[PDB]
Every structure is written in C-alpha cells, then in structure tokens.
Amino acid sequence: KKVVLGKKGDTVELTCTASQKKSIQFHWKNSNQIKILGNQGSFLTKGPSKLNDRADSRRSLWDQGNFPLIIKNLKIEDSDTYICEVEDQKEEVQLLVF
Amino acid sequence: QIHLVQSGTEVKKPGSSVTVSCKAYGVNTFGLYAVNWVRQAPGQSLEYIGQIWRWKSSASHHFRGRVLISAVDLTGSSPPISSLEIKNLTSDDTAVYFCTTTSTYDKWSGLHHDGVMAFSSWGQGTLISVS
Amino acid sequence: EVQLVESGAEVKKPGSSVKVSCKASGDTFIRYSFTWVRQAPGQGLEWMGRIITILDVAHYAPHLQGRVTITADKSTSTVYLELRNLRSDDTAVYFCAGVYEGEADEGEYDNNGFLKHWGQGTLVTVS
Amino acid sequence: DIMTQSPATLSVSPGERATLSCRASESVSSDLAWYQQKPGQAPRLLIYGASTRATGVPARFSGSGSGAEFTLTISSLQSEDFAVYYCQQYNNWPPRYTFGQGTRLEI
Amino acid sequence: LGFLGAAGSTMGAASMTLTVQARNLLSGTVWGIKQLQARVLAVERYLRDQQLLGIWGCSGKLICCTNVPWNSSWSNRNLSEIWDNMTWLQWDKEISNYTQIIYGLLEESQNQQEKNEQDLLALD
Amino acid sequence: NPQEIHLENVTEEFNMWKNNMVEQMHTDIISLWDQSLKPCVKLTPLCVNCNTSAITQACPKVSFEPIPIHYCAPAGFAILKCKDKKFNGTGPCPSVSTVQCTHGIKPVVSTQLLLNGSLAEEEVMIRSENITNNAKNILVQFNTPVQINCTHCNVSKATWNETLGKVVKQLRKHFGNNTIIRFANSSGGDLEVTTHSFNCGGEFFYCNTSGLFNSTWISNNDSITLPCRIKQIINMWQRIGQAMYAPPIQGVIRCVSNITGLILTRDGGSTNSTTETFRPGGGDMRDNWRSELYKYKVVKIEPLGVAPTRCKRRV
Ligand SMILES: *[C@@H]1O[C@H](CO)[C@@H](O[C@@H]2O[C@H](CO)[C@@H](O[C@@H]3O[C@H](CO[C@H]4O[C@H](CO)[C@@H](O)[C@H](O)[C@@H]4O)[C@@H](O)[C@H](O[C@H]4O[C@H](CO)[C@@H](O)[C@H](O)[C@@H]4O)[C@@H]3O)[C@H](O)[C@H]2NC(C)=O)[C@H](O)[C@H]1NC(C)=O
Ligand SMILES: *[C@@H]1O[C@H](CO)[C@@H](O[C@@H]2O[C@H](CO)[C@@H](O[C@@H]3O[C@H](CO[C@H]4O[C@H](CO)[C@@H](O)[C@H](O)[C@@H]4O)[C@@H](O)[C@H](O[C@H]4O[C@H](CO)[C@@H](O)[C@H](O)[C@@H]4O)[C@@H]3O)[C@H](O)[C@H]2NC(C)=O)[C@H](O)[C@H]1NC(C)=O
Ligand SMILES: *[C@@H]1O[C@H](CO)[C@@H](O[C@@H]2O[C@H](CO)[C@@H](O[C@@H]3O[C@H](CO)[C@@H](O)[C@H](O[C@H]4O[C@H](CO)[C@@H](O)[C@H](O)[C@@H]4O)[C@@H]3O)[C@H](O)[C@H]2NC(C)=O)[C@H](O)[C@H]1NC(C)=O
C-alpha cells in the first residue's frame, strides 16, 4: 500500500508493480471495485468507469512488471484509493487531491 | 492470502438445533474445496464430527443421525458459506465448532485421506454454551 | 488533404550537414505518409524516400543510405530532412508531399505510392 | 531495380498531339500515377490508377496502358500542357518507387 | 474389473482387480517420416524400462515376497485386512510412492541376499 | 484412430485453470504465427523510459482458415477427458474418459466470441473462475454454431435472440431466481475490444457489437447488418505492438463463419439481483488459450503397485 499526494489538474501516474517481470491479467479499480481498465494480454481495455477519458495505462512496462495508470486533468473526484489488482498481492495505491 | 471466518457467538436452549457458518475468503466452490467439520469440547481436544465432501451431508457413526452438513456454495459477491446442523443440543453439546477449507482439485501432493483431509486453515472458533 | 510549406533554399559545402523542414497544415498529420522528392536540374527525378508520419519510418534510397536522415515532428507538424556527405549534384529542389493514405492508425490503409498534394520546393544548393 | 519515358526531346508546336510514355524495368499492370511537373515547380497529379483520371484533371489527358509500358495521350496540346511529365509505380514491396524521365512540351 | 471402473475404500481388491486384469494382461513424397521416429523412441524407452525391469529381484506378479522387511514402523496391517478393496488418489500417490520405496529396497535386498548367498552358499 | 477409454464410477474433478496442457498450446501458436503470416510492421517497446523497437518484413496475404489440431502425448502421459453435462470449469466430472490424444479441437485465435470452436452443454455453460464476481472474466462457450455472414456482417436476429435467451436463463439459474438481466453496449477500449476480430476469409472485419446487446429478458428479424471495418493496421495480438498488412484482394469480402463462444465483460455494480447488466469485450489470448483445452490433465505411469502379504516366495 502506498499513499500518494496530488493536486487538482495534475498528470499523475499510479503504478501497478508485481514481483515477477511478466505481463498478466491486471484490473485497475476504484474503491468500489469498479473496473477502471485492464488488458486482454496485448490490448488496452478501458473498463466501465467514470475516469474512462482520464485514466490511461503505459504499454511498454507491462512486460517490465508495471501496469500503471496515468490520469490527466486530475480532480478531487479523481482522488480515490485505486486498486492495483496484480498477483493477488494488490498494491492498492492511495491518492489525495483536495 | 486466504482467511477463514466462522459464525459468531451463539447460546441455544437445551434440546435444540444449531446453524453455524463457515465463510471462506479466497475460495471458489465446495466442489473444489470440501469442508470437514470438527467440534471441540471447551478447553479440551478437537473431535472430528464429519464432512461435506462433494456436497455430501454426512458425519461419523458417533455423530450419525444427529449431525448433517450443508455447505451453501456462493462465490464472488459472497464467499463459500459452509453451514452445520446439529440437532438436539443438550447441555453436553456445549462445544467449540470448527470448519476447514482445503482444496480437493489438487490430487497428487499430500492433502487428503478417504475424506479426512489435511487441515491447512481454520476459522475463528465458536464457543456455544447450551443453556 | 494537407498543405505543405518547406524551409528556405540554403547554400552548403560538399560534405556538410543541412536540415530541411516541411510544415504541414490541413487534415490529420500523422495519418498521412509524407514523401520527399528531390528535383535534379533538367532531368528525371531521383526517388529519395517515403516517410509514414505515425510510423515515423523514413524510407531511403539505396544510394542515399547513410547520407540522409529524414526526421519528423508530430507536435509542430514539421518533417525535417538532414543531408550529410553532400555533393555537387545534391543541389536540387526537394519536395515533401502529402497524400490521403486513409487510416494508418485505425483501419483500412493501402500504403499508397501515389502523391496528390505537394510541398513548395527547396533548392538546397551545395557549393 | 526500377521509371523512364521514351520521348527525350519534343519541340512540337502547341496543338500537335504530343508523345508521353512511361517505361519501367518490371511489369506493373495495375498501379501507376502520372504527374505534371513544369520545370522548377511541383508535379501535378494527372492520372492515378493508370485507367482513370483525377479530380480537376480534364479529359485531354487520356493516359492508358496495361503492363510495364504506359502512355499518356493528349488530344490537343493546350497552352497549359507544357511541362515535364512523370509516372510512378505503386505496386511492389518495399516501396522504392522512382519517377519517370520526363518530356518537355516547349513551344 | 475395469480400467478405472470401481470406487471403494483401500487396500485389497485392487490387488484382486489388478489380479484379474493381469490374468488377462494381453487383451488377446509419399507416406510417413515423422511417425516412425516416435515409434522408435517409444520402443527404446519401453525396452530400457524392460531391461531395468529385468535386473530386479522379484520377477513375479501381484503376489510377491522380495526380501526387504516392511518393518513395524511401516507395518500396521492386520492379517485379514490386507486383502479387501482399494481405490483412493492423493492418498494413492503417497501409497504408490510407498510402493516404490519398498520396491527398490526389496529388489536391492533380494539382489543382496542372492549376491550374498552367491558368495557364501556354495550349493553343490 | 483417436483412442478413448471411458472411466466408470470415477468422480474425477477438473479445473480449467490448472491444466498444464494449456501451457503448451499458446507457445505452439505464437511460434507458429511468427514463422507464419507476417505483418509488414512489428513493434516491441523495450527498455534496452523504454526503447520502442521495430522489425520490418514482408506481409503477403493468403486465404486463411483454421484447421483442427489434436493434441498427442509422448509415451505414457495419459490424458483424461471430462464428458459430464454440468461442467462449471472449476468443477467435478462424473463422466470421465481417458484419451491418448485430444478430441477434434478446432481453435481460433479471436476476440470476445470464440469462432469455429467446440460446444457447451445443453444451453450454454458458465465455466468462469468466479460465476458472479465483478473481478473475473466470464468464460462461456456456445452450443449452436452461430452463422455470421460478412460481406459489414449480416448477423441474424432470431439466432442472436435465442443465444441471448439461453445465456440469460443460464445466468438466472446460476444467479438470481426472480431477476431481470439486460444487456448493455460495448465497454470501450481498442479496435478489437469494442469491435470483434474473427477469421473472415483470412481478413478481420470489425463490427462494434453494441447494436446486438440491448435485449431485456423477462423472468417473471432479417439481418442485423453491423458496420465492420477493413483491416490493414491493428495492434498485434501476439505481444504489445502494432502491425501492417497487404490490401485485400476484394472490395466486398465474402466469407462463411460459424461463431461458438461467449466471453464478455460486465459493469459490476450492485445492481446484484435487482437487474444484471453485461457488456461485450474480453477474449484474452491467454484466456482463449485456456478455453480450448478446458477438460483435461496429464498423468503417467510405470507398471507397479502393492499388497503387503506373507506369501514368501523364493526371490
Ligand atoms: C472469486 O471472488 C472472490 C471475491 O469476490 C475472491 O475472494 C477474495 O479473495 C481475497 C484473497 O484471494 C480475499 O482477501 C483476503 O481477505 C481476508 C479477509 O479480510 C476481509 O474481511 C475483514 C473482516 O471483515 C475486513 O476487515 C477486510 O478489509 C477484508 O474485507 C484477509 O484477512 C486477507 O488478508 C490476508 O493477507 C494479507 C496480505 O497482505 C495480510 O496482510 C493479512 O494479514 C491476511 O493475512 C485477504 O486480504 C477476499 O476477502 C476474498 N473475498 C471474498 C468475498 O471472499 C476469490 O479469490 C475469487 N476466486 C479466485 C479463484 O480468485
Ligand atoms: C461502437 O463504438 C463506438 C465507440 O465507443 C461508438 O462511437 C460513439 O458514437 C456516438 C454516436 O452514437 C458518438 O456520439 C457522437 O459524437 C459526435 C461528435 O464527433 C465529433 O467530435 C469528436 C470529438 O468529441 C471528434 O473526434 C469527431 O471526429 C467529430 O468531430 C456528434 O457529432 C454526434 O452527434 C450527432 O448526432 C446527434 C443526434 O442528436 C445530432 O444532434 C448531431 O448534430 C450529430 O449529427 C454524436 O453525439 C460518440 O462520440 C462515439 N464515441 C464514444 C462514445 O466514445 C459507436 O457508436 C458504437 N456503435 C454503435 C453504438 O452502433
Ligand atoms: C460446480 O459443479 C458441481 C457439479 O458439476 C457442483 O456440485 C454439485 O452441487 C450440488 C448443489 O450445489 C450438489 O447437490 C446436492 O446433492 C445432495 C445429495 O442429494 C443434496 O443433499 C444437497 O442438498 C444439500 O444442500 C442444500 C442446499 O441448501 C441444503 O439445504 C440441504 O440441507 C442439503 O444438505 C444438494 O442438492 C451436487 O451433489 C454437487 N455435485 C458434486 C459432484 O459434487 C458445484 O456446486 C458447482 N459449483 C458452482 C459454484 O456452481
């Protein structure tokens, strides 16, 4: 678990780091476990969410173990304890925007 | 990464029935995860009551006709809930109940014998003083 | 459909580096493959190379391998052309060209070799 | 491994049916562009596909041919037909398509 | 009985069902390069298994007494309980691995007694 | 001569997530697509922050059709075929039948709905890891070959309403006695995510399956011509990157394809038993790979076993 600060309107990145250097089926979620985004192994599946146009993942670090999420035009409403679903040892990242 | 939770605190009348639960977080189904029910005299050793392998309501000969086991299978929004039915709760039935969730799919490493499986994890433990 | 404006005509020495820009204003700049077409004074044209913008893969002539580096900038919508190891006949009017290639980013794309739109021309003299 | 034109010098008066060819090094038969490049200017596309004209190009530019050799025919050499014409293949892979040789239609 | 056609508590009828199956242990440009090499590798592996089978001290089937003492640490079997019925999987791999440990020990001991007596007997 | 011996009274369980037969299929398929039909553009971003690499080769196009691939084992390595009716993926099998080689499996590397594959049991079968968790991918296969005619794809409506009806009843049987399950449009994402990739004469038309999933079923019709897309440049499904191919030989491309499978996403709200809403998407390469070989496991043996006796035979 990691606590990350922030301000409204900042390009923030939330990493999803695993232990092994592999690309697996990950699932980005909000505090309500709603699907923000994920992957079908080689595609970017922007799951059903409110931050569809805000959240975005990086392609090149999936094989490097990271399945991050980049949010543009950050908001107080975009501040949530985002669930990094990877390897069942979830590094659920915390975001503070007020 | 897997934790087992049993029912809470229950006090029943002498000569009644009980319905305790066994929630299994991180568990899929009773078809893959059979549950063996074991009781415990308060403070003393634990005596194996019976089991619900492959959705089979059964118990030992010492517990036959008095104990039958149902395990409501749910997954996803609700963890697999293994129930337990013990009829005619006398004062002697004052005991601490226990469930055990262990995989049944793995069939070549060391987990089970004719239903009596290796008890890997356990729940909290439900002290029931029948009064 | 895009409009293309290049850099100005520059004077260089044989065996030096020069950079020739190509600004493109119009439809989607990355979906269109741009093609630099030099113009030797008087005779037929020499095919230099073809660069798809979103791919940023600048093709080059086999004789021009290692003496030309066509770069591109998606942000400023400017495609550059670098010429090193210059010669006398390198004095030519260069023509970056735009053409409707379809969707190089989304779907159907035939990778057309023909060129409808063009640049403005740049006589990069070498002396 | 590849475009040229058969007429090298053509000093005909405007009106005379000029000659505009397209010589290749290999068979194409389905992919050829045509160009109208006045000396010192940009090539104006005339025919694309080798069997159909372009938008804004009049019917005087009747380009035809099927194979490696092609020929753009002009019915009446107008006063705007003077240029150095070209032809570009768009058939083989990887794209290494050269342009034609050119033929002036000077007065 | 059958190729996995029974389900019961363990130890004996498997010796009996395997006894019946073993009593009837026999059940009685063009065309080909890849399949032949697989057949050759299969017969090489089978025959290598058979020669290793041949260097053993039991050479008998379904009722065999090779020389290692399945000691009291391992022996808990009641006399009549030895031959009744047997199916049971996770339990079986542990049973089967126990079968093999006695096998290697048994054949090593009969090879050892055969060799020991071979050096010592000397049986005229 | 495919060999198969039925196993009687063997309550053998099977998990479609721990097969190990699955493990080799995608390796064979990726190696095959590499030796195989080649794009003109290969992209592999790697930190060597990372350095986007590129490999350029030729991209010829041929008429492509999936061929059936049986899966044979070496000497020993007995394979076991589950043949029950109620198979929920991670479930037991009353009817088990061992095999030497697998059955007539016709796999297709594809998106959301599996093309030209096997069939489910009597309506459809909910075989996913979790049935109604809003965290897992729904793994269902069809039972009827849904013929899709693509020229745009003339998707039938009676068969589509029937497959939605069979799946909606099975979802109710799995979860919700008195519940209404409504279908929603696409989830969103890449081209192959919103639309659906499938083998259409070698090519891959792309129709957004948003005009198909809007059916409200109650617990208590010529052709749905969806708008498809000509495929020339798509993200590679093998790994992370993009591709580029040759133009098609046909302006209007004809093909005949039967689609058999149902893998799609879900909203995940609660919205638990009031109404259930599901959206198209999914079709993982890793999951389709698991979805073909879902009823097997490999075990081997040497001819041995004991009975501790007092037989005492010489040697
Ligand atoms: C099918 O879908 C279900 C969910 O829909 C999945 O089940 C979940 O599985 C995960 C782990 O795989 C479970 O997470 C574990 O939860 C335990 C219980 O904690 C909950 O309950 C307490 C008490 O109410 C709350 O305070 C708490 O916030 C949780 O809500 C934890 O004890 C576990 O933690 C253990 O590991 C961590 C690792 O860091 C340690 O720090 C802890 O000390 C502890 O040792 C763990 O977090 C989750 O609860 C399950 N949910 C349900 C509903 O069952 C299935 O996994 C899925 N099927 C498959 C195959 O994946
Ligand atoms: C399959 O999946 C795709 C992607 O999810 C769906 O695409 C969405 O389609 C809807 C229409 O149903 C789109 O909504 C439309 O937006 C248009 C705006 O486009 C301009 O602006 C964008 C930037 O926002 C540019 O990129 C674009 O090039 C355009 O410049 C509007 O013009 C549309 O309005 C039209 O209809 C209304 C009807 O009242 C009229 O009043 C208008 O005057 C106008 O004629 C419309 O609002 C939406 O943007 C698409 N993308 C999404 C949701 O991400 C497909 O529809 C779907 N297939 C289906 C459902 O069959
Ligand atoms: C995945 O599939 C497997 C099988 O394909 C499935 O296991 C089956 O579960 C059902 C019930 O969910 C079992 O049916 C039982 O049969 C016995 C014998 O008659 C009954 O006694 C059972 O009733 C008990 O449960 C009731 C439920 O409330 C209790 O109230 C009651 O008191 C009884 O104790 C029940 O009808 C069936 O036997 C198994 N099959 C096998 C082979 O184990 C599994 O549940 C599926 N999993 C999921 C998540 O769908």
TrEMBL record, chain E:
Please list the residues annotated as glycosylated. N71, N78, N85, N97
Membrane topology summary:
Single-pass type I membrane protein
Identify the stretch(es) annotated as Immunosuppression.
Answer: 34-52
Q: Which cysteines are joined by disulfide bonds?
A: C58-C64
Q: Where do transmembrane segments lie in this chain?
A: 1-16
Coiled-coil segments on the chain, per record: 93-124
Write out the annotated subcellular location: Virion membrane; Host cell membrane; Host endosome membrane
- Domain Retroviral envelope protein GP41-like, chain residue ranges per copy: 11-124
Q: Where is this region: Fusion peptide?
A: 1-13
Quote the protein name from its UniProt record. Transmembrane protein gp41
Q: Which organism is it from?
A: Human immunodeficiency virus type 1 (HIV-1)
Included range, full protein: 517 to 661 of 860
